[PDB]
RNA sequence: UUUGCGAAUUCGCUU
RNA sequence: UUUGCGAAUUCGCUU
């Protein structure tokens, strides 16, 4: 075995998105507000690189890379776990083509092994889980399960499922609230008429959503017939209101998912 | 939101 | 010759 190096990818929102730049009128999500973050596990030390900005949805995030631990060993089983999770991040979360990126969390900041094992256990790790509700086993809504979630529609896009940040819980709406489109009276009807979906819960609030994808390179700030059609499609996509009962919750929390989309930027800076 | 997914028509590039 | 390379316009898909 060889001794290990563990680095924290420390993230702080040093300049939040000004009102004039917040075109999609989002909430701002400072990375520092949640303890669980990312890190890098290497065989050899990383040369001390200065702080650098990535430009995210919430504004300007300062990226630092501090040493957490060195000189320690890890078992074969632990590295195999860390590695598989490394590959999951880039292939399933970020959907793409330094030795190991891995999740850290406090108990002080350390390798979050239990988090990784939970992800392996989960059934919404790759696609859409089979969940069966009836009148006697109806869907139950827990507000806190949607406080920091990434949800995926169970009822479409099976080939490659869409993942959305939960952007708002509308506690004033229910599957019986009026439907935005006129061809349907309610949400319940829409999903029944169009998708043949029955709901066991009719008290559940509905979900406002935001798409999870973004450009690879975030090192610079954001500031035509097919490009136009996409702008409208992406706008309709973001104004979608979802029924919780119809969505699986992804095992990767939303606050971590936000940080994961910064990774290719950071890895690229560290190499070139 | 990066070349979102999928159809149709028009046009340029070779010797 | 497999979705050849690159432009333009029209249209469908989400709630």
Instruction: Give the nearest nucleotide to A215, CA to C1'.
Output: B2
Is the Cα dihedral A27, A31, A36, A37 positive or negative? positive
The answer to whether strand B lies under 7 Å from the CB of residue A51 is no
Cβ-proximal residues to A193 (8 Å cutoff; 6+ apart), any chain: A184
Give the distance, in angstroms, between residue A96 CA and nucleotide C1 C1': 29
Q: For chain A, after which residues does the C atom lie more than 2.5 Å from the next written residue's N, i.e. where is it broken?
A: 97, 107, 223
Strand C proximal residues, A:60-89, Cβ < 7 Å = none
Instruction: Give the nearest nucleotide to A181, CA to C1'.
Output: C15
Cβ-proximal residues to A270 (8 Å cutoff; 6+ apart), any chain: A46, A49, A65, A98
Secondary structure percentages of chain A, helix, strand, coil, to 5: 30, 25, 45
Largest CA distance in chain A: 66
Record the resolution, in angstroms: 2.6
The answer to whether strand B lies under 7 Å from the CB of residue A22 is no
CA A106, CA A114: separation in Å to the nearest integer? 12
What residues does CATH 2.170.260.10 cover in chain A? 127-211+222-249
Cβ-proximal residues to A18 (8 Å cutoff; 6+ apart), any chain: A59
Q: How was this structure determined?
A: X-ray
Provide the strand spans (E) within chain A: 4-16, 37-42, 52-56, 59-72, 100-106, 109-111, 150-153, 164-170, 206-211, 241-242, 247-249
Q: What CATH topology corresponds to A127-211+222-249?
A: paz domain (2.170.260)
Coil, strand or helix at A20: helix
The answer to whether strand C lies under 7 Å from the CB of residue A240 is yes
Residue with tokens 């008429």: A193
Residue with tokens 């793409």: A96
CA A141, CA A65: separation in Å to the nearest integer? 39
Instruction: Give the nearest nucleotide to A212, CA to C1'.
Output: B1
Q: Are A163 and A250 in contact (CB under 8 A)?
A: yes
- Compute the residue count for chain A: 272
The answer to whether strand B lies under 7 Å from the CB of residue A215 is yes
Coil, strand or helix at A237: helix
Nearest-Å Rg of the Cα atoms of chain A is: 21
Cα of first residue to Cα of last residue in chain A, in angstroms, is 29
Instruction: Give the nearest nucleotide to A214, CA to C1'.
Output: B1
CA A266, CA A272: separation in Å to the nearest integer? 10
Enumerate the H helices of chain A as residue ranges.
Answer: 76-88, 113-121, 187-195, 226-238, 254-260, 263-271
Give the distance, in angstroms, between residue A225 CA and nucleotide B14 C1': 29
What interhelical angle do A113-121 and A76-88 show, nearest 10? 60
């Amino acid at each position: 075995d060889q001794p290990c190096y563990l680095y924290v990818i420390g993230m702080v929102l040093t300049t939040p998105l000004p009102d004039e730049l917040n075109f999609r009128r989002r909430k701002l999500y400072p990375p520092e507000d949640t303890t669980r973050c990312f890190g890098i596990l290497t065989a050899k030390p990383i040369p001390q690189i200065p702080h650098f900005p990535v430009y995210t949805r919430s504004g300007e995030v300062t990226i630092s890379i501090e040493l957490a631990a060195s000189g320690f060993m890890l078992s074969l089983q632990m590295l195999e776990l860390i590695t598989r999770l490394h590959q999951y991040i880039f292939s399933h979360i970020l959907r793409l083509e330094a030795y190991c990126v891995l999740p850290l969390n406090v108990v002080t900041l350390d390798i979050d092994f239990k988090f990784m094992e939970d992800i392996e256990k989960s059934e919404a790790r790759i696609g859409i889980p089979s969940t069966k509700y009836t009148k006697e086993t109806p869907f139950v809504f827990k507000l806190e399960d949607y406080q920091d979630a990434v949800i995926i529609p169970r009822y479409r896009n099976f080939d490659q499922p869409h993942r959305f940040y939960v952007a708002d819980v509308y506690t004033d709406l229910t599957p019986l609230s009026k439907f935005p489109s006129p061809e349907y009276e309610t949400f319940a009807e829409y999903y029944k008429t169009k998708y043949n979906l029955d709901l066991t819960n009719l008290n559940q609030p509905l979900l406002d959503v935001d798409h999870t994808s973004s450009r690879l390179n975030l090192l610079t700030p954001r500031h035509s017939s097919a490009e136009k059609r996409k702008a409208k499609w992406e706008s309709l996509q973001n104004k979608q209101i979802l029924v919780p009962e119809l969505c699986a919750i992804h095992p990767i929390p939303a606050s971590l998912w936000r940080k994961a989309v910064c990774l290719p930027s950071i890895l690229y800076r560290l190499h070139c």
